[PDB]
Amino acid sequence: KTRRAEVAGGGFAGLTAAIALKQNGWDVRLHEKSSELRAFGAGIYLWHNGLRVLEGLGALDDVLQGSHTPPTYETWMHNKSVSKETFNGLPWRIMTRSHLHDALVNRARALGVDISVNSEAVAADPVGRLTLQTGEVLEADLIVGADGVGSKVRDSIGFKQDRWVSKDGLIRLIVPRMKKELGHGEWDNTIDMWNFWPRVQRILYSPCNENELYLGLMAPAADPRGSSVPIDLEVWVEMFPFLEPCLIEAAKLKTARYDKFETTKLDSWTRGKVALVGDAAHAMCPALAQGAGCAMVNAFSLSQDLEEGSSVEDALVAWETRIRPITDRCQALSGDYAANRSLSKGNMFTPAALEAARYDPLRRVYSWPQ
Amino acid sequence: KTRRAEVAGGGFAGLTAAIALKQNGWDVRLHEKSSELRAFGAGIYLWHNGLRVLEGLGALDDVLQGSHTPPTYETWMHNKSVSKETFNGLPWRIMTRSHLHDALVNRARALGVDISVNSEAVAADPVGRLTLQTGEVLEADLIVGADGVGSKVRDSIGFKQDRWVSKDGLIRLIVPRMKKELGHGEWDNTIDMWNFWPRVQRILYSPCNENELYLGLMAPAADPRGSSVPIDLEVWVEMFPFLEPCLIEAAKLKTARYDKFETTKLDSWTRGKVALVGDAAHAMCPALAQGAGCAMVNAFSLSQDLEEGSSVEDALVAWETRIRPITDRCQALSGDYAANRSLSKGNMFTPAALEAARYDPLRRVYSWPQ
Amino acid sequence: KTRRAEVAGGGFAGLTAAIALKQNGWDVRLHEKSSELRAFGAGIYLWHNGLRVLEGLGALDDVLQGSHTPPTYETWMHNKSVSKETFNGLPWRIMTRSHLHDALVNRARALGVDISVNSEAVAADPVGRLTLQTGEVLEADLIVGADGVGSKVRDSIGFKQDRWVSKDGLIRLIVPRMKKELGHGEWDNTIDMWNFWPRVQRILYSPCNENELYLGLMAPAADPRGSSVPIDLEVWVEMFPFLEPCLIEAAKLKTARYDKFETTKLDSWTRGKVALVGDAAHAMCPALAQGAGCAMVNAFSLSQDLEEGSSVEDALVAWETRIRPITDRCQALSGDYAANRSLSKGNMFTPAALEAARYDPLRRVYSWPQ
Amino acid sequence: KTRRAEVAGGGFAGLTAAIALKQNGWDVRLHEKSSELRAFGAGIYLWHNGLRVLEGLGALDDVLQGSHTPPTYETWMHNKSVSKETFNGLPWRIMTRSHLHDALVNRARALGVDISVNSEAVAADPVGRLTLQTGEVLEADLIVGADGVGSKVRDSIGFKQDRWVSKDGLIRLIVPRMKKELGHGEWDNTIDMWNFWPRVQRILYSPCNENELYLGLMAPAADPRGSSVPIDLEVWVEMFPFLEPCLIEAAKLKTARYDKFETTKLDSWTRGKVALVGDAAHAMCPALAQGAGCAMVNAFSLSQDLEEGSSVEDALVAWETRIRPITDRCQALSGDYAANRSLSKGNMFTPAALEAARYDPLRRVYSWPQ
Ligand SMILES: Cc1cc2nc3c(=O)[nH]c(=O)nc-3n(C[C@H](O)[C@H](O)[C@H](O)COP(=O)(O)OP(=O)(O)OC[C@H]3O[C@@H](n4cnc5c(N)ncnc54)[C@H](O)[C@@H]3O)c2cc1C
Ligand SMILES: Cc1cc2nc3c(=O)[nH]c(=O)nc-3n(C[C@H](O)[C@H](O)[C@H](O)COP(=O)(O)OP(=O)(O)OC[C@H]3O[C@@H](n4cnc5c(N)ncnc54)[C@H](O)[C@@H]3O)c2cc1C
Ligand SMILES: Cc1cc2nc3c(=O)[nH]c(=O)nc-3n(C[C@H](O)[C@H](O)[C@H](O)COP(=O)(O)OP(=O)(O)OC[C@H]3O[C@@H](n4cnc5c(N)ncnc54)[C@H](O)[C@@H]3O)c2cc1C
Ligand SMILES: Cc1cc2nc3c(=O)[nH]c(=O)nc-3n(C[C@H](O)[C@H](O)[C@H](O)COP(=O)(O)OP(=O)(O)OC[C@H]3O[C@@H](n4cnc5c(N)ncnc54)[C@H](O)[C@@H]3O)c2cc1C
């Protein structure tokens, strides 16, 4: 009589789903393909919507401890400050990926979610069968495809989809704050430092706490120096001379990668007892920093619709219908912003842009009016 | 079998108590002595702790709509900016008194709390009798003394107490923002503008929204010009020339008052079926802006301890024991700050100062670590 | 026994020569081709070297009255201030062309220099004959070719020369200061506002006094909108939105012209009794603002070498040899700066750049060390 | 037939007089009471009027080399910048006393002025006799009393006079610039840092060149800590924390003195062949920094009136009548400013205040209109 859930993927969407289900009394197993539990991408921004999921999950406290809300979100064009935005009090937070990952993992273990590493889902059956690459076949009343842009839960079933892998990307790193060495300035701020002249180079400057700074170094793939890993110090120091102490530390990082952006969109998110969540269903452009946020919201809302006493198949359909438009709208707007370079203008966190952040999954309303 | 509560006082503490009790299924009546429901004091700051009570009460949304979180809390000494503080993301909000009052009243009516105006509690009996000035005697399983610094619920029973009414005070007003007329500056900020030379004059500058600015004009009682109502425009414009457009509007206000500060402290907050909440029990200095906050927290926590299935008498005792030390500590620290003029130094919203704001009544933990 | 000088051209170089000669007791006539005495180019910067000539000429006082030394010389790149320079006290001054012109004309009339308008020099003979377009032939012991880049005194004799007329230019205008309307800023500054993105547009912002602002609007000839006269308001307001009140006034000016830069360099400046001064001999790029300065210095120094009791032919040769290298060096450096866009970097008024300004013609030394 | 001048005092006024006279062909001797030629007072401000005297004296170049014109003259009240003034281009300069002293001494020796140290004038006779403390009696056609506030040339003759020695004073020092250690700011500026709260303490911050900073530390005599020598570091660092690296160096200075202000005014400046110049005749308050300036102007103008071919007695009378009102007006205004603390308001270098600086002794007109 205990409902059994099998979750594929140990990213933010999967740990979120697993926790939310385990809290509602599901018997939950989670399968991570990688040989250990880890998050990639250096750092991450969360907002009101995502922090509310964390609250719902019983993991907000561990997240807030040792993370950072900057006094302001600042934008520069050609070293000239063009905007400072605080979103009329709307909560937000910057942290390392590991930090967010550890909190979710620790919460999941505390609740006794069963976790398997080196455990890859290769096939899913909408009647509630999951097949692992070991050949083990698992039965469950619910299957969660949270297995990322390359989701095998998705693709073994067949979902009508558009996927795009961009040619351009960025280099994400964590370095020491070097705050004293930076000298005079507002170095606790989020600072988005755009340039088109003399070259197209941009740094997103993002403190995670008193010790760790998150840097996104962005330049087109066609620029050999800017796209270089480990970082071509000279060309980054040249256009960002004030960040030299941090850029120096960044250049020691041999594991730096130039990762490319990637998006996915599906005509639907469910089939029978199978639900897709996160990048598996809706990877989007980084512009509004809502990829993990939407993923977590949708994962948490999935647990919610499963508490209505309908069949799992009906709940999944009601779930998509309820929650999806927020994601579609955010994905679209984020892609638009990316393509138009809209953030470069500053003051672009309009009410529409913040619609996803403003959403409170817990009470299913929009908060923090702008 | 329905528990019956009688609440004396329609201030923030009383509306909070009434709502929280009505939500838990209490049959609730609230008695306001004044001939109509109204809040005095122009404007008010709330923090995380208080916003969480609002959430608990189902009234946060109406409060957030049309109120304001400044981008920063700034301090000036002699027109020189000495600090900017954002409390590492800790939520806060500025609003007019009416705004907070209307939200609570509207929520209370929506839940069907019975409200009586021109209804003054003059005597309370710890066995659960309340006597109104009309001579009507009401029975209830719980009596809430939320009737302010001059609480008759308190004094008709007899509580060992220290009360202090200060000689000094301030003039609190709401005027138009006049934002364009203010010209260049950071006019959405909270700005606490201290001066000791050439005179002791201070303005707390506090935007409530795009339309309404909340001003606290502070000068010692012994200064005839500064303490004057309606405001002596010349002496305020002189030391605050940049606020002239607002000060001009303020000087039209004939209802301006120089109210004095007032504190109360009691050796205990309960007797039998009677609980004291708010200024009735713990009026404090304005320095940490936590008078209404502590009041609301304590009122909401009272509802909480009444859900443990113990007698009302045991619940009230467990309530005080649980929640009081936060208030005692905040009151004390606030008085210290007031006396030492500690806020004038800037950067004084230390972790200890923010202890009350950091408290989350809903989950009974401290959040937003500093 | 009274020495007789004939001067061709009523620009700054010619009025300077005429005055300096008349002060030393020369009988002086000056011939202006144009039908009236007037100066074109809206505004002008002078420096120490040029102000010392003015002093020597007895015309400094009229110049200082109603002109302007900005508190600082500021440079912007993409609306970001990149330098502020004050040249370690070295005197400088901004004024309208008319202002400088009127002072020289008034001084020349006061000394009784004979001035003829509609009087064009078409031929000069190194034995001391000047022919006017009326056919009048004048004899003199000295002939001054101060007749501009198209000097007929020069060309009727034949001077080995390189002349260059550029394709690019700028629009020079005088408009009201509109200082209040500009609002917050440092609007008494000289501000050199460079941009390469999103277009190559630059404004030199140059207050002449409390009433008059001198604007240089620079854009390549190949840009149809930027090079347009009267000014294409939209494309200038777009990249210089903070100057809108002035740009609005500027757009009313129907007489605005897009003048092109022009340079001249000759293997020598003298022949017999004929000397060439100013643009006739050494027109240069505008970068170091030393065209009129060098012209005036060289014109004043010519008067100086004529007081040594040598023949006029020997004096002219000693004159060139003495004074020319300063001009050659300044011309060259200015052309270099122009071509490299060196001023865009800011802080480029190095000691070498200021070498011409630092020169004191009166005492024949370099002053104001850097 | 060679006119013979005897000058008492080797300060700025006496060296100025001596040089100016020696240039006009006077046979000049100068008597310095002190055992060596030296100037006290750490640093000094000069202006247009004084720099023109230097020019007239043939000593400007040595002065400009290794001295400093700040980009701006800034005023602070309670660490808040209240004004920045550049005097519409009017020349000025800051330098150490020694620097100004050495230039004058070197020029005087170069011209062959005869200089005697340990040579004190004790008596002067208006018929042209000077008596040295050695008992040597010198005859001359002119006697210059440039022997300071305690002038024996003055007092041995008897001049109706008011002298005032104030109770308050200041500590003048030269320390290293420590510019890097000062960090962010405008550290080449003259900065006049006023405070009345929490104490009456003021620093005049005055860079002399890239190596040397001139500091005036001012506090009332009645403050034991502020008036202390060597400096009470703690009380100066407390109110000027940003100057700590310099204040630290200043506290090593054992020769620091708290000198008091002193003024003198006489009903006349001449008697027969005797003229009084400088502090001997017109010591004034430091406020407009024109004590040495007026002294030098008056000393230089004395040489001027001696070239009119009248008797020395008539020239001296014409001299006083011509030049004195500028000094009387400047002295008076400076005393007013001192008493009213007028400079503390900022923007107080009005046209009237700058009247002395604006005066050009060389051409006997006022320049640099404001
Ligand atoms: C440059 C960049 C910046 C971004 N910044 C932000 C930001 O600031 N804020 C924000 O909210 N979002 C941000 N995002 C987006 C965010 O990173 C993603 O939306 C989010 O991490 C998606 O998480 P997920 O769990 O759905 O997928 P993933 O994080 O990809 O996780 C799935 C986990 O899947 C495991 N796995 C894969 N296949 C299998 C399988 N077959 N079986 C079992 N396990 C499997 C994967 O290995 C991994 O362990 C950013 C994205 C990019 C590219
Ligand atoms: C200058 C100043 C600034 C302040 N700023 C802040 C701030 O920024 N943030 C903050 O949180 N707090 C602030 N406070 C404190 C805050 O105002 C109080 O702590 C709060 O309003 C107390 O509310 P209460 O409901 O307990 O009492 P009250 O607001 O006094 O309310 C009781 C209500 O009691 C009614 N009543 C009285 N007697 C009877 C009776 N006998 N029978 C029936 N009804 C009765 C009263 O008339 C009224 O309607 C400030 C206080 C001052 C003085
Ligand atoms: C855009 C721009 C900005 C500049 N800015 C500065 C600056 O800020 N500071 C500075 O010092 N310099 C500046 N200059 C350069 C400066 O304008 C010239 O160097 C200066 O005006 C040359 O003066 P001139 O008297 O030699 O020649 P002109 O000013 O050309 O004067 C000669 C006069 O010659 C008359 N004339 C011509 N032919 C005859 C003839 N045949 N017979 C009789 N009369 C004749 C001309 O009509 C006119 O009246 C700038 C130049 C440009 C192009
Ligand atoms: C705090 C302070 C700050 C000041 N700042 C400035 C400033 O910034 N700019 C400015 O222009 N002015 C300033 N002044 C004023 C300026 O210092 C004086 O006006 C100036 O130094 C007067 O010079 P003097 O040569 O007349 O007298 P002194 O400098 O006193 O010189 C006379 C010389 O007299 C020698 N002597 C004295 N008696 C005899 C004698 N009997 N026989 C022979 N020799 C004798 C003295 O010993 C000395 O060598 C300031 C003054 C003060 C107090």
CB B259 within 8 A of CB B221: no
Q: How far, in Å, CA of C228 to CA of C218, rounded?
A: 11
Task: Give every CB contact of residue B25 below 8 A, 6+ residues apart in sequence.
Answer: B2, B3
Q: Which amino acid is at A227?
A: S
Q: Which residues of chain C make contact with B186, given a CB cutoff of 8 A? A: none
CB D139 within 8 A of CB D128: yes
Query: Tokens in use for B26?
Result: 């209490």
C103 and C229 housed in the same domain: no
The closest alpha carbon to B209, from B48, B52, B45, B70, belongs to B70
Q: How far, in Å, CA of D128 to CA of D145, rounded?
A: 12
Question: Which of A244, A261, A278 represents a domain boundary (last residue)?
Answer: A261
Q: Which DSSP helix (H) or strand (E) runs through D330?
A: helix D312-340
- 3-class secondary-structure state, position B295: helix
Q: How far, in Å, CA of A330 to CA of A316, rounded?
A: 21
- List of E strands, C25-72: 27-31, 43-47
Task: Give every CB contact of residue B160 below 8 A, 6+ residues apart in sequence.
Answer: B266, B267, B268
**Would you say how long chain B is, in residues?**
370
Query: Tokens in use for A96?
Result: 């390392």
- 3-class secondary-structure state, position B130: strand
Q: Tell me, what DSSP letter sits at residue A119?
A: -
Task: Give every CB contact of residue A39 below 8 A, 6+ residues apart in sequence.
Answer: A11, A12, A97, A98, A100, A101
- Measured in degrees and rounded to the nearest 5, phi and psi for residue D315 equal -60, -45
Query: Tokens in use for C252?
Result: 């009313």
Cis peptide, bond prior to residue A230, ω within 30 of zero: yes
Query: Measured from the CB, is residue B271 less than 6 Å from ligand 2?
Result: no
Cα(C331) to centroid of ligand 3, in Å? 15
Residues C230-241 as b/e (b if ≥16 CB within 10 A, e otherwise) read: ebbbebbbebbe
Q: How far, in Å, CA of B283 to CA of B330, rounded?
A: 11
A141 and A244 housed in the same domain: no
Q: Which DSSP helix (H) or strand (E) runs through C14?
A: helix C12-23
Q: How far, in Å, CA of B282 to CA of A10, rounded?
A: 50
Mutation to probe ligand 1, out of A279, A284, A302, A343 (largest number of atoms < 8 A from CB)? A279
CB D299 within 8 A of CB D146: yes
The closest alpha carbon to A362, from A173, A103, A91, belongs to A91
The closest alpha carbon to B246, from B200, B169, B198, B193, belongs to B193
The closest alpha carbon to B10, from B97, B69, B84, B70, belongs to B97
Query: Measured from the CB, is residue D34 less than 6 Å from ligand 4?
Result: yes
What residue's CA is closest to ligand 2, atom 27? B148
Query: Measured from the CB, is residue D19 less than 6 Å from ligand 4?
Result: no
Which numbered ligand comes closest to the C-alpha of C133?
3
CB D138 within 8 A of CB D30: no
Nearest CA in chain B to A59: B367
Residues B294-318 as b/e (b if ≥16 CB within 10 A, e otherwise) read: bbbbbbbbbbbbbeeeeebbebbbb
Cis peptide, bond prior to residue B91, ω within 30 of zero: no
Task: Give every CB contact of residue B143 below 8 A, 6+ residues apart in sequence.
Answer: B5, B6, B7, B8, B124, B128, B129, B130, B153, B273, B274, B275
Question: Which of C211, C241, C261 represents a domain boundary (last residue)?
Answer: C261
Resolution expressed in Å: 2.3
B213 and B103 housed in the same domain: no
What residue's CA is closest to ligand 3, atom 53? C261
Helices (H), B148-261: 152-155, 179-182, 233-239, 244-250
CB C152 within 8 A of CB C122: yes
Query: Measured from the CB, is residue A148 less than 6 Å from ligand 1?
Result: yes
- 3-class secondary-structure state, position A130: strand
The closest alpha carbon to A90, from A59, A67, A69, belongs to A69
Cis peptide, bond prior to residue A198, ω within 30 of zero: yes
CB B66 within 8 A of CB B314: no
Query: Tokens in use for D193?
Result: 């840092």
C-alpha distance across the termini of chain B, in Å:
46
Residue D308's Cα: distance from chain center in Å? Answer: 28
Query: Tokens in use for B298?
Result: 């304590």
Query: Tokens in use for B59?
Result: 């009234």
Cα(A57) to centroid of ligand 4, in Å? 80
CA D127 vs CA B164, D6, D75, D146: distances in Å: 84, 13, 50, 18
Cα(C171) to centroid of ligand 3, in Å? 16
D270 and D345 housed in the same domain: yes
Pick D368's closest partner by Cβ from C64, C72, C84.
Answer: C64
CB B246 within 8 A of CB B175: yes
Mutation to probe ligand 4, out of D6, D7, D12 (largest number of atoms < 8 A from CB)? D12
Nearest CA in chain C to B181: C183
Cα(C292) to centroid of ligand 3, in Å? 7
Q: How many helices (H) and strands (E) does chain A have?
A: 12, 20
Q: How far, in Å, CA of A94 to CA of A63, rounded?
A: 10
Kindly report the CATH number assigned to the domain that includes residue D280: 3.50.50.60
Instruction: Count CB atoms within 10 A of the CB of residue C103.
Output: 23
Query: Measured from the CB, is residue B169 less than 6 Å from ligand 2?
Result: no
The closest alpha carbon to A166, from A343, A28, A339, belongs to A339
Query: Tokens in use for B69?
Result: 């979180």
A315 and A290 housed in the same domain: yes
Cis peptide, bond prior to residue B325, ω within 30 of zero: no
- 3-class secondary-structure state, position A118: coil
Domain count, chain D: 2
Residues A23-32 as b/e (b if ≥16 CB within 10 A, e otherwise) read: beebbbbbbb
B284 and B257 housed in the same domain: no
D270 and D364 housed in the same domain: yes
Structural Rg of chain A based on CA atoms: 21
DSSP, residue by residue, C213-235: EEEEEEE-TT-TTTT-SS--HHH
**Nearest ligand 1 atom to alpha carbon A170:** 1
- 3-class secondary-structure state, position D128: coil
Question: Which of B261, B279, B297 represents a domain boundary (last residue)?
Answer: B261
Tell me whether residue A309 is exposed, middle or buried, using C-beta atoms within 10 angstroms of its C-beta: 0 to 12, 13 to 18, 19 or more.
exposed
Cis peptide, bond prior to residue B230, ω within 30 of zero: yes
CA B324 vs CA B149, B278, B317, B319, B329: distances in Å: 17, 11, 11, 8, 9
Cα(B194) to centroid of ligand 3, in Å? 58
Structural Rg of chain C based on CA atoms: 21
Q: How far, in Å, CA of A340 to CA of A328, rounded?
A: 18
**Nearest ligand 4 atom to alpha carbon D292:** 11
- Enumerate the β-bridge partners of residue B262: B165
Q: How far, in Å, CA of B153 to CA of B278, rounded?
A: 12
- Measured in degrees and rounded to the nearest 5, phi and psi for residue C14 equal -75, -40
- Output the CA torsion sign for B333, B338, B341, B343: positive
Could you give the maximum distance between any two Cα atoms of chain B, in Å? 66
Cα(D117) to centroid of ligand 4, in Å? 16
Q: How do B190-194 and B73-77 pair as beta strands? A: parallel
- 3-class secondary-structure state, position D351: coil
C-alpha distance across the termini of chain A, in Å:
46
- Output the CA torsion sign for D227, D231, D235, D240: positive
Query: Tokens in use for D28?
Result: 């000049």
Give the structural domain span for C286: 1-39+97-166+262-370
Q: How far, in Å, CA of C122 to CA of C8, rounded?
A: 9
Q: How far, in Å, CA of D133 to CA of D128, rounded?
A: 17
**Would you say how long chain A is, in residues?**
370
Nearest CA in chain B to C184: B184
Query: Measured from the CB, is residue A14 less than 6 Å from ligand 1?
Result: yes
Nearest CA in chain A to B59: A367
Kindly report the CATH number assigned to the domain that includes residue C66: 3.30.9.10
B228 and B365 housed in the same domain: no
B110 and B32 housed in the same domain: yes
Which numbered ligand comes closest to the C-alpha of A289?
1
CB D10 within 8 A of CB D37: yes
CB-facing half-sphere around the CA of A265: CA atoms within 13 A: 13
- Enumerate the β-bridge partners of residue D93: D46
The closest alpha carbon to C62, from C22, C23, C105, C30, belongs to C105
D105 and D77 housed in the same domain: no
The closest alpha carbon to A359, from A63, A100, A56, A44, belongs to A56
C316 and C174 housed in the same domain: no
Query: Measured from the CB, is residue B73 less than 6 Å from ligand 2?
Result: no
Chains that touch C (3 or more CB pairs under 8 A): A, B, D
Q: How far, in Å, CA of C109 to CA of C30, rounded?
A: 11
Q: How far, in Å, CA of A36 to CA of C83, rounded?
A: 53
CB pairs under 8 A between B and C: 4
A315 and A341 housed in the same domain: yes
Residue from A82, A197, A200, A242 whose CB has the most chain C CBs within 10 Å, to mutate: A197
- List of E strands, chain C: 4-8, 27-31, 43-47, 73-77, 80-85, 92-96, 114-116, 121-125, 129-132, 137-139, 142-145, 161-176, 190-194, 202-207, 212-219, 258-266, 270-271, 274-276, 359-360, 365-366
Nearest CA in chain C to D188: C88
Q: How far, in Å, CA of D153 to CA of C222, rounded?
A: 78
